[PDB]
Amino acid sequence: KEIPEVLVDPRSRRRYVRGRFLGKGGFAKCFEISDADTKEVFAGKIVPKSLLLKPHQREKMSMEISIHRSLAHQHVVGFHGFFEDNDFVFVVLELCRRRSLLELHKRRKALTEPEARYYLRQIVLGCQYLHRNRVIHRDLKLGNLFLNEDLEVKIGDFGLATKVEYDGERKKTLCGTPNYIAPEVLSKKGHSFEVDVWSIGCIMYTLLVGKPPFETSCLKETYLRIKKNEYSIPKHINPVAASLIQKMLQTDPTARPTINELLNDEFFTSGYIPARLPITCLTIPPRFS
Amino acid sequence: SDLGKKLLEAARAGQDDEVRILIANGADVNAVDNTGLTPLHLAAVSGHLEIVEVLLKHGADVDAADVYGFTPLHLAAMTGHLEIVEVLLKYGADVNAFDMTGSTPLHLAADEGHLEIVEVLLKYGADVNAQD
Ligand SMILES: CC[C@@H]1C(=O)N(C)c2cnc(Nc3ccc(C(=O)NC4CCN(C)CC4)cc3OC)nc2N1C1CCCC1
């Protein structure tokens, strides 16, 4: 019932002092934890084994760990290890000290295009790495796109992730409900890598427009709009960006750009990408050029 | 509505008279929004000197920390608002307050090239070797 003040990994011998509470992450309580020797600080995800009923929460825990630990990329949350005691599962992740795009979004709403471009490029590069390693994230959203001290995006939260095991595999099952539901998830047809492109589409819309593309006050109406592809890009959005949104937010998953084609859109290869975002960009709009 | 919410919006927008009215009508000067921004944060980051002063005179918490660990002084320093930096220090802002990167207002001011701010922070006791 009580979380240890010191976390001891039986395997690696590393010992971690439990620090400040960061919040719940689903079923997990999360804390800043510091290595007693090296003094490095990490984000610790602590999941009570009592909440790991064998169904969708347990093997989900194993899947997140299996997938995440196999990953290493500039734009993926660092995985630093996992271990357990009789009562808890402990996951040691990279502490992302500038929060997530959710916090940014709440403060800023619509970003400037150069900002969106800066963030989106990193999101796409990160997701390209996943796809090339046969991983679909399936739950990309503002809250799991973390920022480090350099305001580099780190893709986190692999709780809905799956590994494509063979070519042309159609996934039919998720161990939870994604934030942005792709049309093909609403359908019986199954789904694949294109669900991440859909979510990146939603994210790009939200970053540029300042509100989600489909969401209304009624889930039924929302789901209906998704399946009918009913959304509107405001007229002040620039054509290249608008066009790219339209390419991603299409019902037919085969009609969307692959992640590589997405990375290579005019939106990224032209238009300004700042060398640096000033730290003011977490709170107020920045001036450019 | 909630006077707190109204006071947050007025401090952001730089509405000097609205801020005074709301404060006279009992608005909580220490109201927080959904990322821990107080009226003082919002005024400070937006360069609203008059509102910063009004809030401080009425006992606004000078070292309130937002969801990033930013105090109003962090936000003023990073945006280059010298006069706001000065007044925050005058009301006893912690010149070595750490955000969640272990950065003080001096670190942030230096990184943004606001060198006049750096010199003022140094004048009021900023420690270059401050560490979390
Ligand atoms: C580990 C889980 C998950 C993850 O996967 N990673 C990679 C992660 C990396 N870095 C962070 N960073 C921080 C997260 C929260 C805070 C913080 O200050 N939180 C609150 C402020 C309001 N207060 C009343 C309660 C505490 C500071 C962080 O960095 C300094 N969080 C991460 N989370 C989040 C952990 C809670 C939700 C999810």
From CA B21, how far away is CA B35, in angstroms rounded? 25
CATH architecture for the domain at A100-272 = Orthogonal Bundle (1.10)
From CA A118, how far away is CA A214, in angstroms rounded? 24
The answer for residues whose C-beta is within 8 angstroms of residue B37's C-beta and 6 or more apart is A107, A283, B8, B66
- CA angle in degrees (0–180, nearest 5) for A84-A87-A91: 35
Alpha helix (H) residue ranges in chain A: 59-68, 101-108, 113-132, 183-186, 194-209, 219-228, 239-248, 259-263, 266-269
- Please give the C-alpha separations between residue B13 and each of A160, A168, B88, in angstroms, as whole numbers: 41, 54, 20
Tokens of A190: 């199954």
Q: Find residues 62-101 of chain B whose CB sits inside 8 Å of chain A.
A: 67-68, 70, 75, 78-79, 100-101
Provide the β-strand partners of residue A45.
Answer: A30, A91
Residue in A35, A37, A85, A139 annotated catalytic:
A139
Residue type, B15: Q
Tokens of B48: 């609203």
Q: Phi and psi of B124, rounded to 5°?
A: -100, 20
Is residue A139 part of the annotated active site? The answer reads yes
Tokens of A5: 């003040």
Element housing B24 (H / E):
helix B16-24
* 3-class SS of residue A52: coil
- Beta-sheet pairing, A28-35 with A79-84: unpaired
Nearest to B98, CA basis, from B52, B57, B129, B123: B129
Nearest to B60, CA basis, from B37, B83, B38: B38
DSSP letter string over B82-126?
A: HHHHHHHHHTT--TT---TTS--HHHHHHHTT-HHHHHHHHHTT-
Number of helices (H) and strands (E) in chain A: give both, helices first. Answer: 9, 10
- Beta-sheet pairing, A6-8 with A28-35: unpaired
A141 is in an annotated binding site: yes
User: Does CATH place domain A11-99 in 3.10.450.50?
Assistant: no
**What secondary structure letter does DSSP report for A182?**
-
Confirm if A82 and A92 have CB atoms less than 8 A apart.
Answer: yes
- Residue B79: which domain range? 2-130
The enclosing domain of B84 has a CATH number of 1.25.40.20
Q: Count the domains in chain B.
A: 1
From CA A220, how far away is CA A243, in angstroms rounded? 27
Count Cβ atoms below 10 Å from residue B98 Cβ, excluding itself.
Answer: 18
Report the phi/psi class of residue A118: left, alpha or beta, with left for phi > 0 and alpha for psi in -120 to 50.
alpha
Count Cβ atoms below 10 Å from residue A114 Cβ, excluding itself.
Answer: 16
Question: Solved how?
Answer: X-ray
DSSP letter string over A66-91?
A: HHHTT---TTBPPEEEEEE-SSEEEE
Distance A24 CA to ligand 1 centre (A): 8
Count Cβ atoms below 10 Å from residue B123 Cβ, excluding itself.
Answer: 11
Positive or negative, the CA dihedral A213, A217, A221, A223 is positive
Residue A63: CA count within 13 A, CB half-sphere: 22
Tokens of B125: 């006791």
Residue type, B127: D
Distance A45 CA to ligand 1 centre (A): 10
Confirm if A176 and A139 have CB atoms less than 8 A apart.
Answer: yes
The reply to whether residue A106 touches residue B35, judged by beta carbons under 8 angstroms, is yes
CA dihedral B80, B83, B86, B91 (to 10 degrees): -120
DSSP letter string over A216-271?
A: -S-HHHHHHHHHHT-----TTS-HHHHHHHHHHS-SSGGGSPPHHHHHTSHHHHSS
Give the ligand 1 atom nearest the CA of A157. 5
From CA A265, how far away is CA A254, in angstroms rounded? 17
From CA A233, how far away is CA A213, in angstroms rounded? 8
From CA B91, how far away is CA B56, in angstroms rounded? 7
- Please give the C-alpha separations between residue A193 and each of A168, A202, A254, B124, in angstroms, as whole numbers: 10, 15, 10, 55
Nearest to A4, CA basis, from A65, A69, A82, A89: A89
Long-range Cβ contacts of A198-202 (<8 Å, 24+ apart): A198/A248, A198/A249, A198/A253, A198/A256, A199/A137, A199/A139, A199/A140, A199/A141, A200/A120, A200/A123, A200/A124, A200/A127, A200/A140, A200/A248, A200/A262, A201/A245, A201/A247, A201/A248, A201/A249, A201/A256, A202/A249
Nearest to A199, CA basis, from A264, A248, A268, A238: A248
Q: CA A142 from chain center: how many Å? A: 7
Nearest to A16, CA basis, from A90, A70, A99: A90
Residue type, A2: E
**What secondary structure letter does DSSP report for B39?**
H
Nearest to A212, CA basis, from A224, A202, A223, A198: A202
CATH 3.30.200.20 range(s) for chain A read: 11-99
* 3-class SS of residue A149: coil
Confirm if A143 and A100 have CB atoms less than 8 A apart.
Answer: yes
Contact residues of ligand 1, CB 6 A cut-off = A 21-23, 25, 30, 43, 45, 77, 93-97, 146, 156-157; B 67, 100
From CA A170, how far away is CA A194, in angstroms rounded? 11
Q: Phi and psi of A25, rounded to 5°?
A: -125, 90
Provide the β-strand partners of residue A6.
Answer: A17
